[PDB]
Structures are given as C-alpha cells and as structure tokens.
C-alpha cells in the first residue's frame, strides 16, 4: 500500500536498472568479459533449447602461406573453427519474504530493492561459473597439460610454484589478471608473502592484491583428506581475460502478485543467461532435462574439448599448504 | 524482533511441471529487554565553568 | 582460521574481533598485526587482517591448575547485531538545590 | 613491547620516548631507528616507530 514501483509495478524504468546494477555491482569484472559484443546479443536473441550457439574463435591465422608463383594456386582456404558447443541455462525465483522484506527496505525503493536483487544474482553467477569449471576442467585426462600438483610433503605456495604454474603457458604471458583462492591459502600468503591491500583507482575501496593481478576470494574449494595430516587445495589460476556471457531475455521479467487466505505477496524475476568457458565443448550425455541441466549434473562428468593445448585459457595446481 | 534475513535468494530451475515458491522457515519467538539508564552530575560550577569559557 | 570457519553457515562474513590485552601482546610481539588508518577519519585502529579489533582489558579470564591462563576473546565480526533508540521525555533538565549549594544535570 | 603494553587498557597513547645516548647507539646499530623529517616544516628529529623520540 505504498509507492512501491514493484507493488505499483512499473516493469519499465525498473528492469534495465536491475540488470545494469547487476553487471556493475558484481565482480569478477574483470577477469571475465563485461558487456559482450552485439554478436552474442544477437545469437542471444532468441534461439531455443540447445546445445547453444557458435561462438567463433576470434581470428583466422594460418600456417605456411605457400610459395606463390606461377601455378599451384592459392587454396581458399583452411579452417579449424567448427563447434565449441556449450549450454544455455535458465534460472529464477520469487522473493523469500513477504512485502515484509520488500518495503521493509523502505518507502520508495526505486533503487533499493533493485540493488538487492542485483547483488543476489551477482552471487548466483559466482557460484554457477565456479562450480562449473571445478566440475569439468580438473577431472578428465584431456586437460592434464594445464594442471600442476607437486603437493606431496614439499611446497608452500609462495613466490616459486606460483612462477611455475604462472608460466605453464609458455607462449602467452601478461594474460594473468584474476587469481582464485582458498581462504587458508591466502592466510599462509599474507603471513609469509607481501600480498598488499591496494585501493586501485577511482573509485571504491578496496580489494586485495598479490602482484599486479586482482585476486578473488571465494568460499567453495574442493578439499581432500589424505592420511598423516595433509590437506590439498585447489585455488584455480586463470585471470585469462576472458570468459564470455550473453543475457538473452525471458518473458515477464517481474510480476507482482499476492495471495488471499494468508497475508503475503510475492515478487519474482526468472532471468535467463548464457555463460561458459571457450574453451571446452559441452557434450550431451548422462543428463536429464531440459533445459538447463542442473548444478550437480552441470558438473559431475562428461565434457570434451577441442583446440587443444593453447588459448584455453585456464590452469590449476594442487599445492600443499604451509606446513 | 522480526527476521527479514536480507535477500535470501536461491536457485531452483524452470521445468515442465513445477513452479517456484518462497520459503517460511519456522518462525520462533522474535527476545529482548528494553533498559532504562540515566544519572546526575556531581558537578559544582565544575561542569559549566570548569569545562571552560563557551 | 578454524574459528573463522566456525560461523555456522558463514565464511567471509567476519568484521571485527573482541580481545584481551595479553593475547594481542603475543600478537604485536610476533606477527604483522597491522597499524591501519583506512576508515575515515582519524588514527587509528589495530588491525589483524582486513578487520578492526576492539580491545579492552576488562574481559573474562579462567584459571587452571599449574596456574595457567585461558583467555576468551569473542570472535564474531557478525555484521551485525542491533540496537534501536527509543526515547523518554525530558531529555535534559536544569535544576538547583537549597542546603548543599550546587546545580546538577540529569539526562536519562 | 612488554614495557609498551604494561598499560593493558590504553594504547596508542605512546608518543614521546625518553632515551639515554648509549641505548640509542645500540639501537641505531641493531634496530631500524630512522631519520625522518615529519612535521611541516623544519628538519629534523629521530624516530624509532611512529613515536617521536627525545
């Protein structure tokens, strides 16, 4: 019974504010892409149950460029960009509480509730992508070239194994920007190493920094237990610059509805988005659906890559902690 | 003392047969104590002038 | 770090630390515990890791046998707990007296 | 550190430090006591840590 641009429900003047606020409050960014090109805003227009889309490399290159002379004319030409199939996913929910949370925020949440939902989908994107990579990249024999371990009895993750894992891409360098981390690791690090609290630029305060790279703290990491005291950690290293995503759009972004027998009302969002590494291809096996797949099933097994070796671009290493 | 627990949001999925619903979660007591305090000043002219000029 | 897991469903929600003097004596003896002017405006608060610490000598203390000292040092950094004002009437009064010669203030 | 915290409640109330010459000799040998022009203007005074020394 108030201003409530949601309970007076102006769908315009609201939804774009929501999505934009989501993009530039969330991070990542960057790390990964921000405001991907019209290409993906086109193939994001509207498509259907995949598979997904293509999604070129970017560029063209070649080898050779033969010996042009009289004859043995050109040959128009060779490729090697064919698939990279991936998933299109669908999400949404209502709001948990009543109008109680909604305008409990306040009177005129033209901004407010929008900020709320925005931060929410931020965390969403975080979890889905992180668990996704973790579910796939590590477990297969196909990616092995991108993983290091050591990680038996010998190594602290300082200043050296970081060098090795950093240069496991021997051609490409200065492509490392983000760094994924488990809390305990950065504890050992801020103990020994120089990891440095730096407000970077204007504006806002602030993030941690190891070197030159902008680090990302996360809660969820696979943690094993081997006998004798050991604990092995993951903490992916990518900061590739980048991954990519495109939104698309559903029908009915936000719908204000109430109930009767009880005292409540409900807000809903249900947005679609498309995100994945390119990177490995998503096959179709051992999955129900559809679409999307799931969280778990979006992880457990069955992905397949084609490049192979370079321009993936991600690496992992399982390192012993500070013992 | 209400619990609004901020955003709360989660995932579910969009499927053929189902629909999202928000949650409730076992609303309990709320429990607090409103307290009453206040005191005097031992002051001489102490507080007023001794605290200074203005 | 263990206790930093101990927030039941939460990690990376920490904010501050409650403490007693002796522990932080061990602290700034050994470790890096940072002197931070970050928040505005003034200098400063002791900082363990990205976080304020609230120090006061008044705390609990235990005693074991062998005359050994267990310390408490609440670790919460919730963000947050809460308090709401409320108000009486007559916020501040001005009054004086006869026999003993003064004037007093009261607020409540 | 010990003498510094012999006040357990109060801290960051240490500013000046009184010193005998021989002591600061030992100190400028081992420790980092550093010569810093600090306030504006004028030059200058020794410093151990943020404290001014006398």
Tokens 């778990």, residue located: A296
What is chain B's alpha carbon radius of gyration, rounded to the nearest angstrom?
Answer: 28
**Contact present, C49 and C17 (Cβ < 8 Å):** no
From the list A183, A191, A197, which residue is nearest C11 (CB)? Answer: A183
Among C63, C68, C39, C65, which residue's Cα sits nearest to residue C51?
A: C39
C18-19/C54-55 β-pairing: parallel
Through-space distance between the first and last CA atoms of chain D, rounded to whole angstroms: 18
Environment class of residue A101 by beta-carbon count within 10 Å: exposed (0-12), middle (13-18) or buried (19+)? buried
Q: A residues 195-224 near C, CB within 8 Å?
A: 197, 205, 208, 217, 219
Task: Report the distance separating Cα A242 and Cα A130, nearest Å.
Answer: 14
What is the dihedral sign for C-alpha A33, A38, A39, A40?
positive
CB contact under 8 A, A100 and B2: yes
Task: Report the distance separating Cα D7 and Cα A192, nearest Å.
Answer: 30
Task: Report the distance separating Cα A165 and Cα A168, nearest Å.
Answer: 5
A147-148/A316-317 β-pairing: parallel
From the list A97, A120, A121, which residue is nearest B4 (CB)? Answer: A97
Q: How far is CA A106 from CA A4, A113, B42, in A?
A: 9, 9, 44
Put simply, whether C106 touches B (Cβ < 8 Å) is yes
Touch between B and D (at least 3 CB pairs under 8 Å): no
The total of other beta-carbon atoms located within 10 Å of residue A137's CB is 23
From the list C86, C104, C106, which residue is nearest B34 (CB)? Answer: C86
Task: Report the distance separating Cα A38 and Cα A93, nearest Å.
Answer: 28
Among A142, A150, A110, which residue's Cα sits nearest to residue A12?
A: A110
Task: Report the distance separating Cα A266 and Cα A255, nearest Å.
Answer: 8
Chain D contact set for C58 (CB, 8 A): 9
* Assigned token pair, D4: 């510094």
Quote the DSSP letter at residue A237: B
Chain A contact set for B30 (CB, 8 A): none
What is chain D's alpha carbon radius of gyration, rounded to the nearest angstrom?
Answer: 12
Quote the DSSP letter at residue B49: I
* Assigned token pair, A209: 């920094």
Cα B26 to the chain's mean position, in Å?
Answer: 20
Q: How many residues does chain D have?
A: 54
CB contact under 8 A, B14 and A120: no
Nearest CA in chain C to D8: C21
Chain A contact set for C11 (CB, 8 A): 183, 219
**Contact present, A265 and A98 (Cβ < 8 Å):** yes
Q: How many residues does chain C have?
A: 108
What is chain A's alpha carbon radius of gyration, rounded to the nearest angstrom?
Answer: 23
Chain C contact set for B47 (CB, 8 A): 105
Q: How far is CA A49 from CA A43, A171, A289, A314, C82, in A?
A: 13, 38, 10, 28, 48
Environment class of residue D22 by beta-carbon count within 10 Å: exposed (0-12), middle (13-18) or buried (19+)? exposed
Through-space distance between the first and last CA atoms of chain A, rounded to whole angstroms: 60
H or E stretch covering C105: strand C103-106
Among A161, A169, A177, which residue's Cα sits nearest to residue A213?
A: A177
Task: Report the distance separating Cα A34 and Cα A23, nearest Å.
Answer: 8
Task: Report the distance separating Cα A197 and Cα D18, nearest Å.
Answer: 34
Q: B residues 23-42 near A, CB within 8 Å?
A: 23
Put simply, whether C56 touches D (Cβ < 8 Å) is yes
What is chain C's alpha carbon radius of gyration, rounded to the nearest angstrom?
Answer: 21
Among A216, A274, A277, which residue's Cα sits nearest to residue A243?
A: A277
Put simply, whether A294 touches B (Cβ < 8 Å) is yes
Chain A contact set for B6 (CB, 8 A): 101, 116
Chain C contact set for A187 (CB, 8 A): 1, 49
The total of other beta-carbon atoms located within 10 Å of residue C81's CB is 6
Put simply, whether C6 touches D (Cβ < 8 Å) is no
Put simply, whether A90 touches C (Cβ < 8 Å) is no
Cis preceding linkage at A308, omega within 30: yes
CB contact under 8 A, A183 and C31: no
Put simply, whether C49 touches A (Cβ < 8 Å) is yes
The total of other beta-carbon atoms located within 10 Å of residue A262's CB is 7
Through-space distance between the first and last CA atoms of chain C, rounded to whole angstroms: 43
User: Which backbone phi and psi does A116 adopt, to 5 degrees?
Assistant: -50, -70
From the list C21, C28, C43, which residue is nearest D8 (CB)? Answer: C21
Q: Chain D closest CA to C103's CA: distance in Å?
A: 33
Task: Report the distance separating Cα C107 and Cα C88, nearest Å.
Answer: 10
Tokens 């990279």, residue located: A84
What is the dihedral sign for C-alpha A160, A166, A171, A177?
negative
- The experimental technique behind this entry is cryo-EM
* Assigned token pair, D49: 């840590």
Q: Is C54 helix (H, G, I), strand (E, B) or coil?
A: strand
Q: Chain A closest CA to B27's CA: distance in Å?
A: 12
From the list A187, A208, A217, which residue is nearest C1 (CB)? Answer: A187
Quote the DSSP letter at residue C66: G
Task: Give this entry's resolution in angstroms.
Answer: 4.5
The total of other beta-carbon atoms located within 10 Å of residue A235's CB is 21
3-state helix, strand, coil in chain A (%, to 5): 25, 15, 65
**Contact present, A147 and A232 (Cβ < 8 Å):** no
Among A119, A241, A134, A263, which residue's Cα sits nearest to residue A178?
A: A241
A129: left (phi over 0), alpha (psi -120 to 50) or beta: alpha
Task: Report the distance separating Cα A61 and Cα A77, nearest Å.
Answer: 11
Environment class of residue C30 by beta-carbon count within 10 Å: exposed (0-12), middle (13-18) or buried (19+)? exposed
Cis preceding linkage at A124, omega within 30: no
From the list B4, B12, B13, which residue is nearest A101 (CB)? Answer: B4
Q: Chain B closest CA to C87's CA: distance in Å?
A: 10
Touching subunits of A (3+ CB pairs, under 8 Å) are B, C
């Amino acid at each position: 019974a108030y201003t409530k641009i949601s309970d007076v429900i102006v769908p315009e003047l609201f939804n774009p504010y929501v999505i934009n606020t989501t993009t530039q409050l969330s991070a990542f960014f960057q790390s990964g892409i921000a405001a991907t090109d019209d290409e993906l805003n086109a193939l994001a227009k509207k498509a259907g149950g995949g598979s997904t889309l293509n999604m070129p490399y970017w560029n063209d290159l070649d080898g050779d460029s033969q010996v042009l002379n009289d004859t043995d004319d050109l040959v128009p030409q060779k490729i090697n960009a064919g698939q990279d199939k991936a998933v299109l996913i669908l999400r949404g929910n209502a709001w948990s509480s009543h109008d109680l949370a909604a305008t409990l925020s306040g009177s005129d949440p033209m901004q407010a509730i929008g900020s709320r939902v925005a931060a929410y989908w931020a965390r969403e994107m975080q979890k889905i992508v992180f668990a996704e990579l973790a579910g796939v990249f590590s477990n297969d024999d196909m990616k092995d070239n991108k993983l290091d371990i050591s990680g038996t009895a010998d190594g602290i993750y300082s200043a050296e194994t970081f060098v090795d894992a950093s240069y496991k891409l021997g051609d490409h360098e200065s492509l490392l920007t983000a760094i994924g981390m488990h809390s305990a690791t950065m504890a050992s690090a801020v103990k020994q190493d120089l990891i440095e609290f730096v407000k970077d630029s204007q504006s806002g305060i602030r993030f941690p920094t190891y070197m030159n790279k902008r680090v990302i703290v996360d809660d969820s990491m696979p943690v094993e237990t081997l006998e004798d005291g050991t604990k092995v950690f993951t903490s992916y290293l990518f900061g590739a610059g980048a991954l990519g995503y495109a939104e698309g759009q559903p029908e009915v972004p936000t719908e204000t509805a109430r109930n009767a027998l009880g005292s409540q009302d409900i807000l809903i969002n249900r947005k679609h988005f498309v995100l994945h590494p390119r990177g490995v291809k998503f096959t179709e096996n051992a999955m129900a659906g559809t679409t999307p797949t799931d969280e778990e099933l979006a992880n457990g097994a069955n992905w397949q890559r084609v490049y192979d070796p370079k321009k993936i671009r991600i690496v992992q290493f399982k390192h012993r902690l500070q013992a």
